[PDB]
Design a protein around this motif. Structure first.
Motif, PDB file in Angstrom:
ATOM      1  N   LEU A 152       0.814  -1.221   0.000  1.00  0.00           N
ATOM      2  CA  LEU A 152       0.000   0.000   0.000  1.00  0.00           C
ATOM      3  C   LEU A 152       0.855   1.283   0.000  1.00  0.00           C
ATOM      4  O   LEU A 152       0.523   2.258  -0.671  1.00  0.00           O
ATOM      5  CB  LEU A 152      -0.945   0.011   1.202  1.00  0.00           C
ATOM      6  N   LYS A 153       1.944   1.285   0.758  1.00  0.00           N
ATOM      7  CA  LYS A 153       2.850   2.425   0.770  1.00  0.00           C
ATOM      8  C   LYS A 153       3.450   2.680  -0.608  1.00  0.00           C
ATOM      9  O   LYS A 153       3.625   3.819  -1.027  1.00  0.00           O
ATOM     10  CB  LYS A 153       3.965   2.214   1.792  1.00  0.00           C
ATOM     11  N   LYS A 154       3.773   1.602  -1.304  1.00  0.00           N
ATOM     12  CA  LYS A 154       4.272   1.686  -2.665  1.00  0.00           C
ATOM     13  C   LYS A 154       3.252   2.330  -3.606  1.00  0.00           C
ATOM     14  O   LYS A 154       3.602   3.212  -4.414  1.00  0.00           O
ATOM     15  CB  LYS A 154       4.634   0.289  -3.166  1.00  0.00           C
ATOM     16  N   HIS A 155       2.001   1.892  -3.511  1.00  0.00           N
ATOM     17  CA  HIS A 155       0.943   2.488  -4.325  1.00  0.00           C
ATOM     18  C   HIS A 155       0.769   3.967  -3.972  1.00  0.00           C
ATOM     19  O   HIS A 155       0.581   4.803  -4.852  1.00  0.00           O
ATOM     20  CB  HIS A 155      -0.391   1.723  -4.158  1.00  0.00           C
TER      21      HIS A 155
ATOM     22  N   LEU B 136       3.212  10.674  -6.759  1.00  0.00           N
ATOM     23  CA  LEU B 136       4.246  11.022  -7.733  1.00  0.00           C
ATOM     24  C   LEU B 136       3.571  11.402  -9.049  1.00  0.00           C
ATOM     25  O   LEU B 136       3.861  12.454  -9.619  1.00  0.00           O
ATOM     26  CB  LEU B 136       5.226   9.867  -7.952  1.00  0.00           C
ATOM     27  N   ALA B 137       2.677  10.533  -9.525  1.00  0.00           N
ATOM     28  CA  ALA B 137       1.921  10.776 -10.755  1.00  0.00           C
ATOM     29  C   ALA B 137       1.113  12.068 -10.667  1.00  0.00           C
ATOM     30  O   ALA B 137       0.996  12.813 -11.639  1.00  0.00           O
ATOM     31  CB  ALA B 137       0.993   9.601 -11.052  1.00  0.00           C
ATOM     32  N   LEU B 138       0.561  12.314  -9.486  1.00  0.00           N
ATOM     33  CA  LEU B 138      -0.275  13.475  -9.229  1.00  0.00           C
ATOM     34  C   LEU B 138       0.460  14.779  -9.516  1.00  0.00           C
ATOM     35  O   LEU B 138      -0.074  15.664 -10.184  1.00  0.00           O
ATOM     36  CB  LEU B 138      -0.761  13.452  -7.779  1.00  0.00           C
TER      37      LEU B 138
ATOM     38  N   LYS C  94       5.017  -4.049 -12.914  1.00  0.00           N
ATOM     39  CA  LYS C  94       3.737  -3.572 -12.391  1.00  0.00           C
ATOM     40  C   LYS C  94       3.666  -2.045 -12.363  1.00  0.00           C
ATOM     41  O   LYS C  94       4.628  -1.376 -11.999  1.00  0.00           O
ATOM     42  CB  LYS C  94       3.487  -4.132 -10.986  1.00  0.00           C
ATOM     43  N   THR C  95       2.526  -1.492 -12.757  1.00  0.00           N
ATOM     44  CA  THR C  95       2.277  -0.075 -12.524  1.00  0.00           C
ATOM     45  C   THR C  95       1.619   0.119 -11.155  1.00  0.00           C
ATOM     46  O   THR C  95       0.515  -0.360 -10.916  1.00  0.00           O
ATOM     47  CB  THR C  95       1.377   0.537 -13.611  1.00  0.00           C
ATOM     48  N   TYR C  96       2.304   0.812 -10.251  1.00  0.00           N
ATOM     49  CA  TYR C  96       1.744   1.068  -8.948  1.00  0.00           C
ATOM     50  C   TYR C  96       0.898   2.325  -8.991  1.00  0.00           C
ATOM     51  O   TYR C  96       1.046   3.144  -9.897  1.00  0.00           O
ATOM     52  CB  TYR C  96       2.848   1.193  -7.908  1.00  0.00           C
TER      53      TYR C  96
END
Lengths: 97, 92
Positions: free
Chosen positions: A84-87, A93-95, B8-10
């Motif tokens: 979950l921390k990875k996600h 980051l994407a944001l 994988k895309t996280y």
């Protein structure tokens, strides 16, 4: 049971998750897959509730990602935390881009 | 076939977020669940399904079976502390 069926996540997506961790050509019975689809619904509610409590205990109205991460400890699924921390890291980051 | 190893895309869930949010929204105590929170709850649910299926499969493997039956899922919830919250659903 009418309510569980209306909330249920898609059978094919759940099936793929199930078979993704089993050897090739493993089968999954009717009532077994439905058992897991329904269990999934309750897990959403279970984690949500524990997360909401942590939000409330922090006198916050917004249920935050850190409330979810700390809820894992409370519901005793701490082995999900690293993933979950990875996600979460990837999400913000994407944001910012 | 892809030419390299799997990557994988996280930061994404394979679940339909709107459906997960509908379940989240049923909680009478939550004021608002943020999108980031919903994503993490969705990914945890993916991990949960994988965990339940794995334990069910291990039970099946014990009786030299190749597939998961309903009673594999049931026996898991009957025997394993982590799945106590499912006790009502399976009528243990």
């Amino acid at each position: 049971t009418s309510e569980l069926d209306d909330l249920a996540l898609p059978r094919s997506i759940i099936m793929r998750l199930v078979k993704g961790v089993l050897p090739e050509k493993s089968l999954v019975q009717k009532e077994a897959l439905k058992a897991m689809i329904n269990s999934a619904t309750l897990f959403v509610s279970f984690l949500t509730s524990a997360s909401g409590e942590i939000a409330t205990n922090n006198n916050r109205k917004i249920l935050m990602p850190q409330d979810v991460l700390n809820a894992l400890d409370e519901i005793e699924y701490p082995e999900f935390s690293k993933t979950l921390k990875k996600h979460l890291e990837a999400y913000e980051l994407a944001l910012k881009e | 076939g892809p030419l390299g190893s799997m990557e994988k895309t996280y930061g994404k869930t394979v679940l339909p977020l709107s459906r997960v949010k509908r379940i989240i929204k049923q909680d009478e105590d939550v004021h608002y669940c943020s999108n980031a929170s919903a994503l993490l709850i969705s990914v945890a649910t993916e991990l949960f399904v994988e965990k339940l299926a794995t334990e069910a499969y291990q039970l099946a493997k014990l009786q030299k079976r190749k597939g998961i039956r309903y009673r594999d899922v049931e026996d898991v919830v009957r025997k394993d502390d982590q799945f106590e919250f499912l006790s009502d659903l399976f009528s243990i």
